[PDB]
Structures are given as C-alpha cells and as structure tokens.
Amino acid sequence: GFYENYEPKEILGRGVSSVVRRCIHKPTCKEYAVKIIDVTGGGSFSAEEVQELREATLKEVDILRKVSGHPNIIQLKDTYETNTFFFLVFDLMKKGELFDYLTEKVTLSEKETRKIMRALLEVICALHKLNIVHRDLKPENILLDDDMNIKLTDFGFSCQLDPGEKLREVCGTPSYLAPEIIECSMNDNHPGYGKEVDMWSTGVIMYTLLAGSPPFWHRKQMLMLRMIMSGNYQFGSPEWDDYSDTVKDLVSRFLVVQPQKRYTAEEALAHPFFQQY
Amino acid sequence: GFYENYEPKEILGRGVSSVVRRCIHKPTCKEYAVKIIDVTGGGSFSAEEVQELREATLKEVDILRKVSGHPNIIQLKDTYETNTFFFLVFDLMKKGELFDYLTEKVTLSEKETRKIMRALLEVICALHKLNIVHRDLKPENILLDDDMNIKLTDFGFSCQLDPGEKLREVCGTPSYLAPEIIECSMNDNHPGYGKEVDMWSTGVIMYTLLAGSPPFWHRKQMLMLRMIMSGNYQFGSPEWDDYSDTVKDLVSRFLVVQPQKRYTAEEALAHPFFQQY
C-alpha cells in the first residue's frame, strides 16, 4: 500500500496522535512529507474512541481537498488507510516552520512582520469566505518554502460550518486559545463559538513575532487562563519601543475579549498598517 | 560570561520558557548541552512574573546540586545568570530521550521494560528518601547514554518538602497528571498532594512502553480528564496478549486513584516482577 510505493526516512515532527517523516517516492525518486496517524490510540483505545479518531481524520482530509490549489496553503498529494494507521502524503517543506525561524532570529522586524501577516490574513480571508475555521493557528503550523513564502498546514481541528452552526468543544494549543472557548468550558449554558477564534490566535501570533514572546505567557497555567480571559496583557518595558503606533493598534484590535467587537480578516487587511491612502 | 567560555551549536530541544542547544567548551574542546531559560517571558513579562520565574529557576538549580552524584541522574556542570537569561550547562546525551527511542521501536519487550523500570524506580526511591518530588516524570525527560543507561533530567517543577508540607498547584504534562492534582483544581477546600503523584506518572510511563500508547489517550481533553479521574483504562484487544500477568499486576498497582492505596517505589521494587523468591 504505502510501504510498497514510498520509502520512509527521518522524523521531521511529532503530534499527539501522529508522527511526521521525510519519505522518498519509489517510482519518481522525489521527496515528500508523510503524516502517520494512529487511530487505535498508540497501543489501544476503545471501538468508540477509534471511530471518533477515524472520523476526525476523514474530515481533515476533506478540508485539505476543498482548500487545495491556494498558493499559500499546503498541498495534500495522496492518502492511504488501514485498520490501525492513516498515511497522508504532503509536499516537503525544507526550511521547516515559522516557530523554528523565530527561534533563530529571536524577534522579527516590523517590515518582515508585515510580509508574513499580509500573507497569513489573505489565507484566513479565503477560508472564512468558505465558512471554514482552522481552529489551531500557531507558528508550528505555518511552514516556509525555499523562497520563504508561508504555507499553512495542520487542518486537524478544522471545520466547515453550516448556516447557523456553532462549535462547543474545547480544543487548540493553550497559549493561543480564544477566551470564548475557555468561557465554553466553565458554563454549559453558553451559546457556542465561531470563526472569530481564528482572529484572536492571529493576534497572539503577530505579537509573538514582534516581541519574541507570547502576550499571555505565565508560569502557572491557572493565572495564564485568567489573564487571557480578562485580556490582561501589555506592550512593556524596552521591547516594543522601536515599533510604530500603527502596528500596536492592529495587534490590539485582534486582542479584544468580546468576539463581536473583534477585527475580522477583511477589516485587518484594510488597516493603515497594510496601507490606507 | 557564557559566550566567552562556550560556543553555541544546534537546537536539541525546546520548552515553554527554554531552548536546549549543543555547545562546545572553548578551553577543552568538549561538547555539552545548555538550557537557555528566558525569565523575562520571551519578549516581556511583569516584574512580579519575572521574579516568580527567577525563583523557580534557582530552586531547579538547587535540587540539581542536592541530587548530584547519582549515576542515573543528569549532572549539572556550570550555571550562568543575566538580567534576562539563565544558562545551565549539562553533560551531553547523544542518544537523546526515551520518547525518541520508543518512537523508533513502537513498543518495547517485557524484558527491556524490566531493565528500564528497575533503574527508574531506584532513582525514584532515592529522591523520595530525601523528601524530593520530581513532579514531571515522562519519556521526554528520561535521557539515554552510549551504553543505553537511563539518566533522569528536567527538575523544573521539583520540590524538597518540609515536614508536614503539601503542594496545591496544578502543573505537569496533561496525560501523565495524577488525579489528586486534577482534584485540586476543582475544589479549593482540598488538602493538597504529595510524593504519590510521581508513582501514578511512573505507571503511565510503564504502560506506554509496553503497549505503544498511553493508558488514558483520548481526542477530547474533557473526557481524557474524566477518564483519568475515574481511573477508566484497560489492557485491551490484541496488544497486551503476549505479556504475563505479573507485569499487568504491577502496572495496575500504580494506576490506583486513591493515593493512600497507591504503590510506593520501595513496594514496587519488592514485587514479583523484579523478583520475590
């Protein structure tokens, strides 16, 4: 099936239920990246649990097929399935993620940040026109090619919403979580959440590029969550001194607690930071 | 200070507030591993936040100095401090972590598992005699040397308890968390927790080596936490079929919800699995 067509190489990355490796296509001798997903739960899960994970994986593949073709989104080339594993073959990105890049440069400039955010907002705008929420936006899920162009990946928690539908689950990566998803977990009489969670996360990304660290970074998780819930953050000490007031205005429109008042992708691309007159 | 004595190389690992790199000692030309900790919070934290992180780091160094000398614990060689960073120089472990090892072999045998667990329990027994709790036991924090001997590391959340003292904070890695720490977060009138959380985590480690996956592995975090709280797990389908009833008895004595009934390190080393007569 997959091992008769491809040859497995080294580990490029790892997830909760997946391992990402470099692989050679036997026929053409070209290199690709393969996500190996274990639906059986490492050693063993229940049949119910297995079906939940098999249905989550098929929705991932579905969104990947719908968004195919966009120049700044990763391309899924070929999928394979067995009773325990799923194999998703993707284009290989040699310069890795935006997280690795940030680690080497510590902080990025206002000009380099405008480049990346203009591309990222364009992708978000496209997805939201189709009613799709990514739901896991972060530096580790944004890859770079040889020309340093961004390529969005990991659509594992993604959803295409129906007219009227709202999501109720608590999922994501802790320091990028919007406050409405955390609100959802403390009150079972909450209305739900929608596409707006992606804009908060976008804001966390943008602040982290410019300052070197995340806006709501704290040692104790309980206080981190209280800080994100109240929107307690700041552009402090010497760090943000070199930066204009326009970038800071844009970041603060993303970091708004009430989702109905938060900026959208369309509105963010119209801001003076990307130009206005 | 640190850059005048050592030369920095590649990234070997990354944490929430730290980056671990390979480095050459200028004078002797020998290779070491250096943990770079940012107390300033990436770009910027508050003065309060900074002092909390600076005091957490100094306690880490303290425990590292107290436990120094044990053959199966990592050795801290040299520390450096500035206003924003902390530099902790350690012995370099070329074969990496037990997590990377597990990924390549998928599952380990009963005999290979007896080797690792006998060593790990010995270290835990030593620490608990000194009243020290590690509080973050997991495959990613257990390193291997050239002879494949285990070396315990990451004492970032560790504590030496006073006569009578109990801990009240919620910290660790989600799938290895004992139920008493999760109980602590839902009821502010709980008595606290102690050294017993390390034994639960030890149990999660042992099951994960043998089966290939963690005992309480589920897609939705809310249900994962309910599963760990109730102790709902199983030795299912074909996975555990090859294994004896003695290993399974030992794992189930670790995975006990009531901490007063849970096995200790001393008791675990006396079990028939490691020998009895």
């Binding site: 999922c171 802790p174 977990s185 | 929430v16 989600p174 939705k220 249900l223």
Partner: peptide
C-alpha cells in the same frame, strides 16, 4: 514546545 489538546 506546545501541543494541541481535546477536553
């Protein structure tokens, strides 16, 4: 580093 989760 930080991974994703499901409650």
């Amino acid at each position: 580093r930080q991974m994703s989760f499901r409650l």
